[PDB]
Write a protein that binds this ligand. Structure first.
Ligand SMILES: [Zn+2]
Ligand SMILES: [Zn+2]
Ligand SMILES: [Zn+2]
Ligand SMILES: [Zn+2]
Ligand SMILES: [Zn+2]
Ligand SMILES: [Zn+2]
Ligand SMILES: [Zn+2]
Ligand SMILES: [Zn+2]
Lengths: 362, 362
């Protein structure tokens, strides 16, 4: 009755530690990952302090080693000050994250010249991912070409963006992309229900035509990734709502529902949650690691999933068919039927495994 | 000084056992694979007897288990009689092989309707690969669409074929392809030297414009695979030369030379010899498995490589930069500097590993 899947990978999560641990920490965020059938996560650098230099990465690595319940890699973040300074630690990171749109954070880049500097100085064999919306996609693609290397575009959300990427792929350009579940399963039609606080996310929810274009262009999507971005309900409904949705616990049930409806195949899902994450980010296999899912059980998403400290979900009320029943991680039962059974600290930094270093010429 | 690579995969080898063991057997062919930095091979079904039914597959599996030195999967072959009969054994095979052009073998299909029957009856979640040259590529793509599934095109050799595949990918069609080293590193310009016997291969050597088009369209190539097709020199130079070249021992040195010249990157190589083979064929990781190569050593390909029983090579006289120094397979030293150190029978059928079954809906 159960379907065995390999260990799934989410290349885009915000786990809030250090410095935002009321929103989530490594222990709670990785519990949510395991409950969502995810055994490896790549954590974004917009923490407090942000992971923009070697001391901050060293702290984050120890916090993750002590708190993570699944395996992980940590991104470095590009800043206005750190181009040319990350060479000694770069290979220990998941990749470099460029935040190219609106942020108040120390990740703000004020000029395309700063993007060029990062593309020129970051080691050429290591991943670069970008938060790049609308015309920014075209702009960062131009920088990538000028510097003759690849780029991965995070959370593609619009017809405009997926068609631009499609055209770049048709020209043989080295660009990959990911799409998040909210941009496949929610739209403007849902803003009335969510309200303007809860509904706040970047990239914003798309029109129905945006959603339909992402589905029609599934072939262009290399990865699914949650952009798990936990904030509490008080923050989402307060005066200055921060953008982002929690998503680890709902991503796989939503996508399994689509598989059951024939909207994409099981293989299409596994390419996008396993094989393509591995190959774009050079992430190693996990021995003795698998996920068992039940595809027959129908349930309704509640007002909050059990594990994320966000303690809310924008998918409340959607009917899904697909449940995570058991997760085994490196030979140990990590999750069964609503209970996480590996402690904080069971998870490891995959970039420290011999098989997890990115291959490079001498 | 040495570069560590993951265990490379060759999805297209002819190992001649059962029934052609003067040309190669599992033990000699897998020794050649290991010496070429390959730790997993997918063996084609055009043996004697051909692997076209369950009894023949059972024999071949035991011969491979007893003789193979690296890990493997075995293809089933489509025949004019076996559509609808392979369902119980299909999941144990690498995939189904369709030989769509000229053959005298029991793999000859005489009608496109027989291709349709195979596409309709072979389990939809399992791989199908085709030997399809020139217009046959377009024809089998049509059959795939009619049956709404994917296909993988073997040894793409021509500008015509790579551009057709490029156009299909631009339309979002589920097609992947592989290219063999002889179609990247040899051309018509080499037929004078090779002669009409040794030079016989299918698909035939291309023009210089064919070769240049494959390089220019590297983005369209999903995999490299040798089409290792050993025949003895007596056969190649005799009255009725069979088509095919040996290639396991020369593939990686040729491609490492191209990497050293900047013609493609190390990552481009590893996508095509590791990640994409894994994901197209659902081949499992190999624990504690890696290849160490030396990129500085220049050498000239001799008149025959050490291991293949073909005892000749069409690349004789080419200068290469790139050598396999050490192979470790599942924790054991399998090859060092010209000596194979695992015995016949060390290799295993990866389709019998729990992680090597192709995932499917219940
Ligand atoms: Zn983002
Ligand atoms: Zn991302
Ligand atoms: Zn994000
Ligand atoms: Zn890799
Ligand atoms: Zn062939
Ligand atoms: Zn092939
Ligand atoms: Zn062949
Ligand atoms: Zn797979």
């Amino acid at each position: 009755k159960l379907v065995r899947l390999p260990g799934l990978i989410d290349v885009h999560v915000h786990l809030r530690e250090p410095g935002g641990t009321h929103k989530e920490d490594f222990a709670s965020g990785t519990a949510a990952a395991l409950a969502g059938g995810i055994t490896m996560v790549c954590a974004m650098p917009n923490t407090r302090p942000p992971i923009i230099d070697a001391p901050a990465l060293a702290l984050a690595q120890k916090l993750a080693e002590a708190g993570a319940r699944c395996d992980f890699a940590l991104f470095l973040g590009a800043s206005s000050e750190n181009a040319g300074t990350l060479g000694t630690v770069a290979g220990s990171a998941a990749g470099l994250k460029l935040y190219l749109n609106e942020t108040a954070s120390e990740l703000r880049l004020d000029s395309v010249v700063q993007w060029m500097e990062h593309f020129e100085t970051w080691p050429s064999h290591l991943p670069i991912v970008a938060h790049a919306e609308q015309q920014t996609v075209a702009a960062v693609l131009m920088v990538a070409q000028l510097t003759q290397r690849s780029v991965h575009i995070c959370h593609v959300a619009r017809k405009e963006e997926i068609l631009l990427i499609k055209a770049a792929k048709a020209r043989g350009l080295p660009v990959t992309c990911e799409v998040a579940p909210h941009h496949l399963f929610l739209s403007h039609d849902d803003l009335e229900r969510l309200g303007p606080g809860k509904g706040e996310v970047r990239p914003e929810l798309g029109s129905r035509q945006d959603v339909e274009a992402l589905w029609e262009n599934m072939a262009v999507i290399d990865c699914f990734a949650s952009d798990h971005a936990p904030h509490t309900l008080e923050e989402k409904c307060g005066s200055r709502p921060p953008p982002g949705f929690p998503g680890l616990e709902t991503m796989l049930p939503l996508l399994l529902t689509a598989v059951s409806e024939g909207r994409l195949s099981l293989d299409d899902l596994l390419q996008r949650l396993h094989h393509n994450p591995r190959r774009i980010f050079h992430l190693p296999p996990q021995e003795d690691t698998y996920v068992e899912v039940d595809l027959e059980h129908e349930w309704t998403i509640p007002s909050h999933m059990p594990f994320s400290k966000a303690h809310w979900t924008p998918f409340e009320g959607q009917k899904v068919k697909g449940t995570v029943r058991r997760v085994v991680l490196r030979g140990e039962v990590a999750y069964i039927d609503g209970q996480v059974l590996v402690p904080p600290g069971y998870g490891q930094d995959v970039r420290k495994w011999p098989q997890g270093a990115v291959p490079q010429l001498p």
